[PDB]
Amino acid sequence: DLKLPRQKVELVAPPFVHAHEQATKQGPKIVEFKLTIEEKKVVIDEKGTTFQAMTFNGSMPGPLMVVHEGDYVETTLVNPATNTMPHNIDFHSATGALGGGALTLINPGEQVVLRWKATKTGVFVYHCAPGGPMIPWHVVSGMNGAVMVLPRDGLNDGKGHALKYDKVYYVGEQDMYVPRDEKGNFKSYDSPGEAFTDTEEMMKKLIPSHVVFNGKVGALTGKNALTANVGENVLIVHSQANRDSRPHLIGGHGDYVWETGKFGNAPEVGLETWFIRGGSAGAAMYKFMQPGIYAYVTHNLIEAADLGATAHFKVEGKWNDDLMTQVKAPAEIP
Amino acid sequence: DLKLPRQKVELVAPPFVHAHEQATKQGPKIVEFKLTIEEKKVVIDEKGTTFQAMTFNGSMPGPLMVVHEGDYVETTLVNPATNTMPHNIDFHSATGALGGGALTLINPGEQVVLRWKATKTGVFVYHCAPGGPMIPWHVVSGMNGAVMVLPRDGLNDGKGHALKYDKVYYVGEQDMYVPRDEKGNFKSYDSPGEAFTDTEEMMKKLIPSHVVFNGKVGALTGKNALTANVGENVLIVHSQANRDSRPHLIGGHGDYVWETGKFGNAPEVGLETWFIRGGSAGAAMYKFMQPGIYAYVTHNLIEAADLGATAHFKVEGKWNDDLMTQVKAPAEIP
Amino acid sequence: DLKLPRQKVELVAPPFVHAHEQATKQGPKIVEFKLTIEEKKVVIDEKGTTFQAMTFNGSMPGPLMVVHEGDYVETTLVNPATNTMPHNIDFHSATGALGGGALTLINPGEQVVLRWKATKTGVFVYHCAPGGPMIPWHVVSGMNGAVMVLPRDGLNDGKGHALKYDKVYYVGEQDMYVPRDEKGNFKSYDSPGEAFTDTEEMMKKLIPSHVVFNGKVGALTGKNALTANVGENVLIVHSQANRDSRPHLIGGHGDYVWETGKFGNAPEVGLETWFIRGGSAGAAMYKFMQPGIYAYVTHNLIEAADLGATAHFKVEGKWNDDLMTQVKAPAEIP
Numbered sequence A, B, C: 001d002l003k004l005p006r007q008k009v010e011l012v013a014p015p016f017v018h019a020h021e022q023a024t025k026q027g028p029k030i031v032e033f034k035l036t037i038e039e040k041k042v043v044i045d046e047k048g049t050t051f052q053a054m055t056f057n058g059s060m061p062g063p064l065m066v067v068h069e070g071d072y073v074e075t076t077l078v079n080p081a082t083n084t085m086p087h088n089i090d091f092h093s094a095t096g097a098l099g100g101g102a103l104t105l106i107n108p109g110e111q112v113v114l115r116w117k118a119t120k121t122g123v124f125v126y127h128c129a130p131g132g133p134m135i136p137w138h139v140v141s142g143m144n145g146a147v148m149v150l151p152r153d154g155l156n157d158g159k160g161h162a163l164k165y166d167k168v169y170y171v172g173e174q175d176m177y178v179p180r181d182e183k184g185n186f187k188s189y190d191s192p193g194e195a196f197t198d199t200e201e202m203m204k205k206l207i208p209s210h211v212v213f214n215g216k217v218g219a220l221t222g223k224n225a226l227t228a229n230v231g232e233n234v235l236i237v238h239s240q241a242n243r244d245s246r247p248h249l250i251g252g253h254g255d256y257v258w259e260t261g262k263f264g265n266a267p268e269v270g271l272e273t274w275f276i277r278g279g280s281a282g283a284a285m286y287k288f289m290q291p292g293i294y295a296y297v298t299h300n301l302i303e304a305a306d307l308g309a310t311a312h313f314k315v316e317g318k319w320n321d322d323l324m325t326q327v328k329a330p331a332e333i334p
């Protein structure tokens, strides 16, 4: 007999986030979301390597869901008959039934509706978890995303001062395990089922072949670079459902960082690199001070440069010579 | 000339913890413990894989020792003549002589008695460390446990409020390195000595074959599941003497977490996943809100599901539909 | 038109640090440093294994630079014509142009001068980053160091009390990737260029062959052990530019630790083991209470004992029997 107002949310593909309020005068609502599972073969790198992906809403990561503390989140999970496997969903933000996993197992052709109360603030992972050895396999195949539960008064610095972001991006990092053949080339498979045996063997050795943001090498570069202007406060939500990450904004800092991702704790200030524990999401805010290109990386630099984990920001505005200047350009040594 | 009262403790096998007070009106005491080293071949998985273990008190991990700040901990370490190797003990809680290691080296047939003052609060690792390449080998063979040094006033939230647990469990995570033969089956050995060469070769490649709680795959499941009731505040002490872990209670949270394990620091609140640095112990408290099965895992899900690192909690009590409800059971898609 | 006083610093090889003030009554200055790149073949272990190193100032790590908040750091980077490759420098302490990387790319025979304002306090990594796959390779070849930006009032405990160190050491940890030949021996190369192909192949598998402090196995042991006396407060700055580390002082503690390395945040107290995220520097202070040998290690004990990551401290002073005592020396079991 829960008779609160209902509000539908139109989810958007990462790294964008659906429109929301930070601080709100709204009371609790039932916020309604729909996720549709899609299994699909995708290209994950510039050499054309393929991968048997399984996704929420067709994307890796799944879309960011945003609600406020005390809202009730009502999710319709749909597993169309064009898929081959059972799936479910586990929200780390939710309390009971294995985060909802025990109440959302659906075969192809079925859908289910789960409601949970958002009692804990922060950014949290959600992922598929359909039992036993299937749990890691579905997660590293792409079935993970995040939810952000905001305080009703918005974010604060722990010292009584509001922290308002001008925009938010969601960067989902995915460790992928693509086996190679005898000659050393990556293998392609006709189905997730067929990829399973070789993939599981590789997974158990714990070293990924690729580590990517937003599903592919170079996904957040070029035309699809993240953007900002000098003076803008940007929130970057970062998730990793299986393996640790160490985010770093090259040329900037984390001005305010919740590395464990939970807004009941004050943020740390002035970080160079932060740490996202496997199975969690964290958040970092930075006010841009300089224009130009920034790279956002995990600062295992082999992963960043060689396995796929680099995004770009293109920042517009005026160069600040007080902060940094080339005193003398490259010249022959005297 | 230390003339304080003496108190004997009867240690109990993990994941249980010997009876103790949280807040106490006792002053400092000499608390007396005995550890007896046992080298033994054990079965570590459901397929019957064997492992040359070396243990304190016959268990992996070694038992949790519990004392209060300012107590003196007096340990009798015994290395029976049925063992083959020298051993010692290093307490991370202790100050000087390599944590006691430099004062406790004993050959088979010998015992030693060490006393140290508990000047630092928290949960701390203890482990064998008998010099050079032997140090990692003895530790990953099972020779590690933990000690908890409580404040005399018990635990607090950093905001002046007492945090009292209704029960405590100790989960010791062990990375194990079992070599395989040419055909790909795990190897068995007649002695720790014989296992050394092949084991060291594998250890240096840094990828474990198994990652287990309480010594074996499935140790804390079934009849030996951890238990609680809705409304109970449970403290989970987690240690890892060699390699990082990322504990996560599936379907719950860390309400209060000391991830670095030290009670001089306020706990963080409302975590989804926490991080236990290799060579440390941490502690997390959670008040159960829902009945049913929970899994406690490291949230590298490949390790949890495929290499052995999953425990269960079975929780009794009344389901709370406000927190979570199946709005519509699995049904055919319209 | 920046007309502040100028101050030259004579850099010193790690683990020592150039003379500096903690708290200062000086106002902002332009502090001038020079770094000269050297590519060179070095011996990294006791068996005589060689490695194609690339360094700032001839050392791994590069020297620690120390300044105060609000100073301007003016660095002359020199790439002599005896080197074979372009190089640059990226300061994590600096704001804009990829930390200076985009303004400091120099071919052999060139030098450049960069100035940046030290707006953020803490210890920060600096490293070479000359684009694409070259970035990880130059960093794991040795091209990394750290800078420490002190508050003008010196360090504090977060509770209003000054924390003054009697000495500081800089420990730079380096993950190295040396390939092996068919028979299993480490390979030697005539040039960095020639080492590249085999080295990159190994790097992408993410497991180092060696993990060393100050450039070599056993660098900070023997004649070159770190030293202290009972009663001395020592600051240990630890950096790792590519891979996580878990520092631990065997027989001691971290009394005050900034594991994320940033002095805008209060230190944690009473740690056993702390965590240095890959791409960062952290700092820990400890007041020695006992004489004798301590080991400082990463507490992945396989790395510490088998791959090279152990330093020693030799501490002079009076043994404290209250803190720790051998009650009964090794004796036959009754």
Ligand SMILES: OC[C@H]1O[C@](O)(CO)[C@@H](O)[C@@H]1O
Binding pocket: A156, A157, A158, A159, A160, A263, A264, A265, A266, A267
């Ligand atoms: O930012 C969150 C933090 O801010 C405060 O409300 C005020 O200090 C704390 O109680 C909380 O942990």
Ligand SMILES: OC[C@H]1O[C@](O)(CO)[C@@H](O)[C@@H]1O
Binding pocket: B156, B157, B158, B159, B160, B263, B264, B265, B266, B267
């Ligand atoms: O919970 C431990 C914390 O609680 C306090 O005593 C009170 O804020 C702090 O000084 C300490 O760090």
Ligand SMILES: OC[C@H]1O[C@](O)(CO)[C@@H](O)[C@@H]1O
Binding pocket: C156, C157, C158, C159, C160, C263, C264, C265, C266, C267
């Ligand atoms: O030590 C640094 C910390 O000390 C304080 O200035 C006083 O509590 C804090 O504002 C800061 O985070």
Ligand SMILES: [Cu+2]
Binding pocket: A054, A086, A087, A088, A128, A129, A130, A138, A143
């Ligand atoms: Cu699934």
Ligand SMILES: [Cu+2]
Binding pocket: A090, A092, A125, A127, A279, B248, B299
């Ligand atoms: Cu999970």
Ligand SMILES: [Cu+2]
Binding pocket: B054, B086, B087, B088, B128, B129, B130, B138, B143
């Ligand atoms: Cu031993």
Ligand SMILES: [Cu+2]
Binding pocket: B090, B092, B125, B127, B279, C248, C299
């Ligand atoms: Cu140890």
Ligand SMILES: [Cu+2]
Binding pocket: C054, C086, C087, C088, C128, C129, C130, C138, C143
């Ligand atoms: Cu370089």
Ligand SMILES: [Cu+2]
Binding pocket: A248, A299, C090, C092, C125, C127, C279
């Ligand atoms: Cu960097």
